[PDB]
Amino acid sequence: NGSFIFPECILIFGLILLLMIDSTSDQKDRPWFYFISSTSLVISITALLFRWREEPIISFSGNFQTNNFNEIFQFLILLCSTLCIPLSVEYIECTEMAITEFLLFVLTATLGGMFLCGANDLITIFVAPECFSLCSYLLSGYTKRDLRSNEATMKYLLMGGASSSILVHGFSWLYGSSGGEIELQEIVNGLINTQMYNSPGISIALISITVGLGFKLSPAPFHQWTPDVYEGSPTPVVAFLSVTSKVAASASATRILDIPFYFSSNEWHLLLEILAILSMILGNLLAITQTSMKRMLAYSSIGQIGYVIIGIIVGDSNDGYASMITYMLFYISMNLGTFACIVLFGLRTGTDNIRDYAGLYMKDPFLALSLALCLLSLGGLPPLAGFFGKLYLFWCGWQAGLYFLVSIGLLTSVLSIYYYLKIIKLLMTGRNQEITPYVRNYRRSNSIELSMTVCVIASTIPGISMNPILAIAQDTLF
Amino acid sequence: NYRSYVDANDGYSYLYPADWRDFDFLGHDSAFKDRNVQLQSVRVAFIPTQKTDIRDLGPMDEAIFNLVNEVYAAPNQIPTIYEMQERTVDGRNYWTFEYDLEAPGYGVSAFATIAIGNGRYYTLIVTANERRWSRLRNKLKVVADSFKIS
Amino acid sequence: PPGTVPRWGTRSYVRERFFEPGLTTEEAAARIRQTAEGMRTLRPMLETMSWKYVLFYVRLKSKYLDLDLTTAMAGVPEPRRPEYVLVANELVDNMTEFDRFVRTPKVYESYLYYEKTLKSLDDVAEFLG
Amino acid sequence: ARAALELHRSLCPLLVSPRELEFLQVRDPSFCSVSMVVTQIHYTARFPDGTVFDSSYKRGRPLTMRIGAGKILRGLQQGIGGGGGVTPMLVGGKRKLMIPPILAYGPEPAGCFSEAVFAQAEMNFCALAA
Amino acid sequence: MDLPGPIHEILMLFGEFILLLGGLGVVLLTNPIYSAFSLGLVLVCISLFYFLLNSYFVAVAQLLIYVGAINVLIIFAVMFVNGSEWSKDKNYWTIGDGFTSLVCITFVFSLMTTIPDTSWYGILWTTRSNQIVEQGLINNVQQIGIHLATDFYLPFELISIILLVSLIGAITMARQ
Amino acid sequence: SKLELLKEVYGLISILPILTLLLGITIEVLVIVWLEREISASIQQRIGPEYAGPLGLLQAIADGTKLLFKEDILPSRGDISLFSIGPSIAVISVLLSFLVIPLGYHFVLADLSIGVFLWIAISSIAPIGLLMAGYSSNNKYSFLGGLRAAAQSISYEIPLTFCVLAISLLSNSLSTVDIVEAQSKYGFFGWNIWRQPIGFLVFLISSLAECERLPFDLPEAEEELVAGYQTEYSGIKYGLFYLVSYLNLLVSSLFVTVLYLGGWNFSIPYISFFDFFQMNKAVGILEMTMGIFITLTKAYLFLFISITIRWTLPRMRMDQLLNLGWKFLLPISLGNLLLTTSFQLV
Amino acid sequence: MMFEHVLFLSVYLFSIGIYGLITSRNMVRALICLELILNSINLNLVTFSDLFDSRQLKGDIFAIFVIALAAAEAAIGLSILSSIHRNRKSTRINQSNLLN
Amino acid sequence: LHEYDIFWTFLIIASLIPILAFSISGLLAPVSEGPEKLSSYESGIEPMGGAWVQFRIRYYMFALVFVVFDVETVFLYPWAMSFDVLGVSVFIEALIFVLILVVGLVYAWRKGALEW
């Protein structure tokens, strides 16, 4: 009896259909569900289009959420999944693995991420991270005959169990000290009629929550799990994770830290800062020494780039959240472009290491150009989009007093320019006796082309057309 | 309605209609409950309170409201007080009244009665789930229309 | 009308009574008198059957008034104080039975003692001061 | 811990009207009542004579609570949602209260290795809805 | 409902001392099957802790879903790890044993000194309206029975698809 | 004064009725083993355990006393670390279940509103003890001999649950006394075995393998290896296993009759046994003994039915047993609940 | 000492649960210790929902959900264990660092 | 739900029962049997040696599907208790719940999981 789950009830309908077709149909599925799932996704996006410019109305018995800011992320995760599925169709197609349950897993993980974006319940915001993590150790290991795909299931399951454990222990400490309360809004009341707020306790339930949060989006001191898994799992699920996991985690973090933690600002504003100052350093130095593409992307595009997003969560008087939304919208595209290019080239050749991208400009120049564009955008150069992203992230964040975080950001961006320009240099070359016999046999040439070309121009145009995006992102109060 | 049991506690003597598997809920000295459904008929509990006839606890419509809304209630409910009536069958001044306790789902009802005679303020109650409270209301009132003491 | 004196709450009942050793005469005379106006607040919570606090509060206030009544009574007027000891028997047997009539939850006896448990406690503290 | 510092004014009221249970006092009723739903008020709590131990202004957004289901001091829920013999406070209203110690924490404090509230206290409020 | 009396703390200390040895057996013994059986002992003696406190469902269910399914599943699993009887003698493994036995003890000290500074018996008085309702006439299988479906509707609707996805993934993975 | 505790030293608990239940269950074990050894081996055969007095009324406790000494051996591989720990879990899993089982009008040992739930929870702890015992040794014929039974037992509790729930949703309770309360209406029309026979069938067929019936298919064929994980268990160990087996049988019979039949109700409703005479004088001991009477006979009927079935079917192999337990009983034991939902919708 | 002595045992289990996790060598032992940590948090949770919050249980439901998710994770991890032991014929955890 | 003191007394008594029986057996027993005593029943003369006798490949799937399908019941019980107490919404909610796992079981049936 409520339409605020219908954006997810449609997804559930599509899930049930995808599970049914394999039970009933024989073999007509392979290119059929490939678009039938896209139908469910676009229909859910159309359903979310309705609730634009809506009220902060509370959920079923006040459970998850329904406001404007949360709806933004609810739509953004859908956007990520819509762009990602065409990538993770043909890749697993060319591995002779069952494809139905892979799309089922991706759909269910997207559902969990969508429910997580709200979840002002203290229990829903616990099951939903599991609905997003329980459907993650499967995908991140869903190539069983491989060997690396088992290491990137062991040292992902152990870590994601320990971290969710620490997080739920912090939740239990909060539930205890709060005189008994779950509803996210109704904690600063209940933590007052029980006068145990300013006491030790809360100081522990803040760290035991922030650590479990960090692990899910991997800043530096807990980044350990990310570089391995991103190399061990198939590239499409690497992209899917490295976009929607970050989006959902950053959507949950701001709400779980701003609503029930009015008072502790001066004691977590610092804390997150200690993460950011590390996240944008240790995630770059190593990125220099890399030779694998997926691992270098793990370092740079995640180990670091999860820095300047946070770079305003600390410095936020509600005048900055717009900048976080804009930077997320830029990052999704400027990351899915390069992941699409990498999937395409890897499939077409069969290698991942950097030293094989030589000469690719001469064999097929379109792919080299559409990869160089996204890489430079990640570098943050003026006419592109990443530049304006980082810019409006600093201009609101220098406008908020804190100085020893913007300087480090600019410096580590300059540092990050290095490996981007390194791989770019490796593209443009003509020393025939240097290029390995990998790009030499490349029959150059639908879905992946379409995704790559409609995701790369969104890495150049919005950086110059950010006026309506900015005017839209300013109406967020959460 | 059909059976008539003093329940041997030397005090009350009230009615209870039918099979009534005769639980022991927490209000001691008596109880009765149905089989198919939950939230069922009479329970009665004693208290010591050394005052006199109920007319001393204040005006009817106020002393009734200070406990139909503060004791027979819960902060997660909304109470609603319907008609209320004095009895005066042996000068005891009983206070029979029918109220509702609406909840998220429950919505229970009641025909509470009170006495003050030598047993010091011991009360009765009846109840049934709201989905069926209408069809047997007049079956339960004659239940409450039995409370006298000795 | 200024603030008041906390006077040794402050602990988790493993710090107190086990690890912060100290109890002076006339200081237990505070706990004794406090559990009188203290235990006189459960009357609303005995009206409605809240059988889960009428046990925890009784256990705590007892285990507190089961040591003070042995320390405080040593410090009353010692020339004439057999009655100040002929009261602790009542003020600690009425409660020892109160704790019985809440374990298997009754109402008649529970409330018949929830008056004859405070009626006495106003006399143990009376011989003190 | 115990009391800390603050600073404010009070907008001196008329004489309080106890109404047999608490101490009631009205300053400005403006717009509209509130049902058993989530509200959002701004408080500034005193001690009986002069001291101030917390104020919603000492943080960011003034806290949000539930007026209608028992989740707060009985004194407040009687003096904000409207108690027996007292009219409820409007949407933009403003009232002043003196809470007796029976409708409050009662005769025992809330300890944290140092009771953050004087044992058996009775405090004051200047509650303004929002 | 309530408990007998001063027999309470006796059973409390008894169960605590049993559970400590159980955990030490879980973590020390090298033979994995002994470890799993000691884990089962830990879980039944913690189900008894759940039952002592007057919370009945979350005790008996915890006894059914863990001391049953999960333990027999783990026993079946230990029929796939071959090679036991590793080294011994006072931190058999490398110095990592000492480093852990240090950092874990620091963690202990921190939390175990944070706890005995909060007057729990004083945090119970400030909430004398939460556990003062009981809805008027209810027993403790209907409390959960209703309050699971009257306001916890979304997570209850959610958990089922998690279970289904986990089943499908487990079958697709374990099968060659 | 009241230094520590006046009336709370030790005088709040009595251990008389528990020991009476112990004596009763032991005597009933003697009765059921007499039933078996005098009916199973006497259909077309000679009489059972004769020469132990007039009949084998002393033979059962004689075997018990013989097994008592029997020099427990404790084989080398595996030791007291898990050997003596094995059958303890087995015996406790069925002994503790006797709590919520009623016997007559106001003769329950504990109300325990989570009664049948507690029984279902305690029924799924035995496999742990079986696996422990079967692995307490090292050689085969006990490792796999216990593994087979521990595995196949797991494949049946789901029908048990989906048949107990199809009665809890009918009685709207979880305490046995209220179950028989919702069943004493029409004497025998209102008996659930007629209202839900589709559930009773599943419960009865599952009860066989749930109490290890049959653990060996033939008087000559072993318990699938050489014996049912109780080979080295010589003395009181095999005695305790014999016990726990018979006790699982007993608890299953008692539960199926207290659920699907009138517990202590006559063929005419239980309350009606008082109204038609207008007065009662000494119905106390009469109703007590008649509750032990009208109840134990109903479970005796199922004891006899199982005894007969023992010699009518070749118990399947654990290549068919799993198939039957999974692909046959599960669908219908779900469908009966799906039906009774709309059936109890009114 | 009900409300006070149990919490004093939460940490005294949680800590152990972490230690066995770190010093674990075989996969099944690591999973056991993980389950142990989850049960520690469960126990630390339930007692809070018995002292207070008895009108509407907010802990017991959360305990139920925690147990359900624990069972799901313990299923999925062992399923992964099947496939790893299929690929390589030994599950020594600390001897697989080919992803670094 | 009033007094589980009988439950606790029955627990301690029935837990003392097995150790009592073992100790009673031990008191009046023979201090003997210093024979080989290192081999177990029905064995080919001293057979000794062997391992890797698992066949866990088949029974593991059964164990997994059972562990997953079990959680249904402990959620149904609070619903099975609260049918008449609440309205009929819980009926539809639990129908959706059970039907999800019915579909799951159908899948586990079609694709070969429950086998010989």
Coordinates of C-alpha atoms in Angstrom, one line a residue, chain C residues 34-111:
Chain C
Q34 CA 17.2 8.0 49.6
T35 CA 15.8 4.6 49.0
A36 CA 12.7 5.7 50.9
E37 CA 11.7 8.6 48.7
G38 CA 13.2 6.4 46.0
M39 CA 11.2 3.2 46.3
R40 CA 8.1 5.4 46.7
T41 CA 8.0 6.1 42.9
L42 CA 7.1 2.5 41.7
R43 CA 3.4 3.0 42.7
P44 CA 2.5 4.0 39.1
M45 CA 4.6 1.2 37.8
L46 CA 2.8 -1.2 40.0
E47 CA -0.6 0.2 38.9
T48 CA 0.2 -0.9 35.4
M49 CA 1.8 -4.4 35.3
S50 CA 5.4 -3.4 34.5
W51 CA 6.8 -6.6 36.0
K52 CA 10.3 -5.9 34.6
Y53 CA 11.3 -2.8 36.6
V54 CA 9.6 -3.8 39.8
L55 CA 12.4 -6.5 39.9
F56 CA 15.5 -4.6 38.8
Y57 CA 14.8 -1.6 41.0
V58 CA 14.0 -3.9 44.0
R59 CA 17.2 -5.9 43.5
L60 CA 19.4 -2.8 43.2
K61 CA 17.8 -0.8 46.0
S62 CA 18.0 -4.0 48.2
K63 CA 21.6 -4.9 47.5
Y64 CA 22.3 -1.2 48.4
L65 CA 20.1 -1.3 51.5
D66 CA 21.4 -4.7 52.5
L67 CA 24.8 -3.2 53.4
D68 CA 24.0 0.3 54.5
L69 CA 21.5 -1.1 57.1
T70 CA 24.5 -3.0 58.6
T71 CA 26.9 0.0 58.4
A72 CA 24.4 2.8 59.3
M73 CA 22.9 1.1 62.3
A74 CA 26.5 1.0 63.6
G75 CA 26.5 4.8 64.2
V76 CA 23.0 5.4 65.5
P77 CA 22.8 6.2 69.2
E78 CA 24.6 3.1 70.5
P79 CA 23.5 3.4 74.2
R80 CA 19.9 2.6 73.2
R81 CA 19.6 1.0 69.8
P82 CA 18.1 -2.6 69.9
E83 CA 15.0 -1.2 68.1
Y84 CA 17.1 0.3 65.4
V85 CA 18.2 -3.3 64.9
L86 CA 14.7 -4.7 65.7
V87 CA 13.5 -2.8 62.6
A88 CA 16.1 -4.0 60.0
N89 CA 14.6 -7.4 60.4
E90 CA 11.2 -6.1 59.2
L91 CA 12.6 -3.6 56.7
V92 CA 14.6 -6.5 55.1
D93 CA 12.1 -9.3 55.4
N94 CA 9.2 -7.3 53.9
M95 CA 11.4 -6.6 51.0
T96 CA 12.7 -10.2 50.9
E97 CA 9.1 -11.2 50.4
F98 CA 8.3 -8.4 48.0
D99 CA 11.1 -10.0 45.9
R100 CA 9.1 -13.3 46.1
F101 CA 5.8 -11.8 45.0
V102 CA 7.3 -10.2 41.9
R103 CA 9.2 -13.3 40.7
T104 CA 6.0 -15.3 40.1
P105 CA 4.0 -12.1 39.3
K106 CA 1.1 -11.6 41.7
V107 CA -0.9 -8.4 42.2
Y108 CA -2.8 -8.6 45.5
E109 CA 0.2 -9.6 47.6
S110 CA 2.6 -7.5 45.5
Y111 CA 0.7 -4.3 46.2

